[PDB]
Design a protein around this ligand. Sequence first.
Ligand code: HEM
Length: 385
Amino acid sequence: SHDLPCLNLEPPKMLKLSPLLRALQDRGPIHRVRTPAGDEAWLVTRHAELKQLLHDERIGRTHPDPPSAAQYVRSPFLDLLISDADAESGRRQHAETRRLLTPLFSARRVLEMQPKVEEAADTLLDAFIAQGPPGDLHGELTVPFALTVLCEVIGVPPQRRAELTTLLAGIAKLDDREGAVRAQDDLFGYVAGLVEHKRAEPGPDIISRLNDGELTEDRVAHLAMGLLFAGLDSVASIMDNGVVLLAAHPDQRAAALADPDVMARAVEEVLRTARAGGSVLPPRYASEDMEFGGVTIRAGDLVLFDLGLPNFDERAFTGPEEFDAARTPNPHLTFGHGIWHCIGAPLARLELRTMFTKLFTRLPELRPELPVEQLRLFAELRVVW
Ligand code: HEM
């Protein structure tokens, strides 16, 4: 019957939404679309409306029949995110997780993380530079940096790190529902052991602090594993894309390097411009019928949160296709918003400001080996300097 527009997985161009996504954003704030998996979904295309939906408690992770729930992509890994719970349960669990995690990232606490973040970048950059160019910025710097910072902050003693790495590759390579339940189970038991160690021997770290709050071992282990998933690929991929963006815009890179305040804004601009559409948060579903934006979203419908659409909405940014390291203000939604806002954001900002500063201070000429066109077609990111 339908002729819904069909979204696809083609990599976006640098600083430009795809023709189809510009046409949708142009046409209206909200549309019925077909996802790359072939299911129906609502795509919200504009900054104001997405922001408002991100605060709407009628959208969440529960679905009464998860196996027939619409999906953006088939992914055994993301399937485990879809709660079977009643909607109210889902909301309470979510609010309680936010209550438990938010104190861990207070101003004072993130200040206390900063010297480990500085130290980890110096150590890893020292090693990456010693190996000489060309090097794989992804596999040899940005991923290890993000993971090291996570170890330091969550409380993974150095001796246990080799196994963590391995269990994490072991969830990265997974590809069926059995293998993905099993890989989760192994990581979980590993993490429960970390929790028991820290009960015996507290540190100034997330696991000890959650222990202190009289949470049971399962609950601490679940929170710690969630933090591992939230803080790893996200950081590495914004960092990778930032190096590409900053290498490609020499005068702004120079302005960012001359003034830490410009560097702070440059980080915000990398966050805004790292992906120009096509990356969608994990699935989220209306838990009850809702009128929104001219349509009726039905209980159980898939609603897509593509944060790159708002980030390139000319209604929210002047000249959205321009990389402006000094853009101010910069209300990007790369950390989500409302009920879905990144609790690690202050830490993520710190990792990005620290690594862009040290990379481009020590290696002023650093750039990708391939030109952007070829790069677009990261598993690896080879750079020279
Ligand atoms: C590197 C840049 C990062 C970006 C761009 C990012 C982005 C986001 C986004 C968009 C959300 C909402 C996700 C969703 O509902 O699907 C989120 C949630 C979350 N992030 Fe981050 N994140 C980053 C790094 C981190 C770090 C380093 C940590 C902590 C170690 C962290 C911890 C969290 C937590 C705990 C949530 C759950 C909050 C909730 O669902 O209410 N993130 N992040």
